[PDB]
């Protein structure tokens, strides 16, 4: 969805004993590049389980 190509998600296959995600598939790598990003919020709306949800911290630098 993104217009900055700022969210890279490498998927991975869920452990059956210690699942770190409720579904059968998870995100072993989830990276987000802030210095690229524009802060649209199309990501959150596109995410169907609403996992990525924009914050309130903003004092980043």
């Amino acid at each position: 969805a993104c217009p900055a190509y700022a969210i890279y998600v490498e998927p991975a296959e869920n452990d059956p004993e210690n699942p770190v995600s409720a579904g059968e598939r998870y995100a072993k790598v989830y990276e987000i590049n802030m210095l690229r990003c524009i802060f649209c919020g199309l990501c959150e709306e596109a995410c169907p389980t609403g996992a990525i949800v924009l914050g309130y911290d903003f004092e980043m630098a």
Partner: protein, 127 residues
């Protein structure tokens, strides 16, 4: 009806059994799916006690010999089903309040179930 609550509690029962029989014989337990109405919940509050919509007991070869599915929240004829594959045997548990989990009118109990499992297992399994 409040049948809902008993139905889900009965679904816990089926699960409970599946772990014991499974570990007893060395035949596998496996979660198949988890509810859409859990995965995709994210602001509607969750209330149910398990997350598992479908689950199975598998043999040494790796094919299932018993499938076990509950109906989720949405349903209009809410039931729990069993199915032996290849055999064309399909069992429908309804709930009748207080009576129990019944297949029609016969109570489904643990002992009943163990026998059902064994007749499945012994017949269908290759391993």
């Amino acid at each position: 009806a409040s049948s809902e609550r008993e139905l889900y509690e009965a679904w816990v029962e089926l699960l409970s059994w599946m772990r014991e029989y499974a570990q007893a014989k060395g035949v596998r337990f496996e979660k198949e799916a988890d509810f859409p109405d859990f995965i995709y919940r994210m602001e509607r509050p969750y209330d149910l006690p398990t997350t598992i919509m479908t689950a199975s007991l598998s043999d040494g070869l790796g094919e299932p010999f018993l499938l076990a599915d509950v109906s989720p929240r949405h349903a209009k004829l809410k039931r729990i089903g069993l199915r032996l594959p290849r055999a064309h045997i399909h069992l429908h548990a309804h709930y009748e309040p207080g009576k129990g989990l019944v297949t029609g009118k016969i109570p489904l109990t643990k002992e009943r179930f163990f026998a059902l499992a064994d007749r499945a297992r012994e017949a269908l399994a290759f391993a």
